[PDB]
Specification:
By secondary structure, the protein is an alpha+beta fold. The protein has one domain. It is built from 3 helices and 7 strands. Strand 4 and strand 5 form a beta hairpin. The chain is globular. It comes from Mycobacterium tuberculosis (strain ATCC 25618 / H37Rv). Belongs to the bacterial ribosomal protein bS1 family. This is Small ribosomal subunit protein bS1.
Length: 157
């Protein structure tokens, strides 16, 4: 069941270009539906499945596959999220850029790092009293790292 509200939330929290963990749910002649989050499914067009030319999506993915895919567009009016597997792989880098994997909020518009609230830059430590914020942040960061490790698996494969 799709809600505008859930799709709007996803858009307000996932920057275009983000690389997200998805599950391949259905193959059609023009691509593969991939579920990224509860009630959030996107389409990888068949042209966005790989670098090589593919005639049927089945040549690249199967229902049940985990795939790290890039968010390339979001259309809330028509409730469609566009995804790309090929572009995820083009953007990949052995060096971890947290900004691509769920930490976009940790960089300002010019791309400088933004120290999280509760952490002191000039001293390079977390502050007393912000233990809960530290834990939320470290969870986020660990999940971003995990996504990158998953992506490294995808490239190694």
């Amino acid at each position: 069941n799709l809600y505008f509200q859930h799709m709007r939330h996803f858009a307000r929290t996932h920057a275009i270009g983000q690389i997200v963990a998805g599950k391949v749910t259905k193959l059609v002649p023009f691509g593969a539906f991939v579920r990224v989050e509860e009630g959030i499914e996107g389409l990888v067009h068949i042209s966005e499945l790989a670098e090589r030319h593919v005639e049927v999506p089945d040549q690249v993915v199967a229902v049940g596959d985990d795939a790290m895919v890039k968010v390339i567009d979001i259309d809330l009016e028509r409730r469609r999220i566009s995804l790309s597997l090929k572009q995820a792989n083009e953007d990949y880098t052995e060096e971890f850029d947290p900004a691509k994997y769920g930490m976009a909020d940790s960089y300002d518009e010019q791309g400088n790092y933004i120290f999280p609230e509760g952490f002191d830059a000039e001293t390079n430590e977390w502050l007393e009293g912000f233990e809960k914020q530290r834990a939320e942040w470290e969870a986020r960061y660990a999940e971003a790292e995990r996504r990158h490790k998953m992506h490294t698996a995808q490239m190694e494969k």
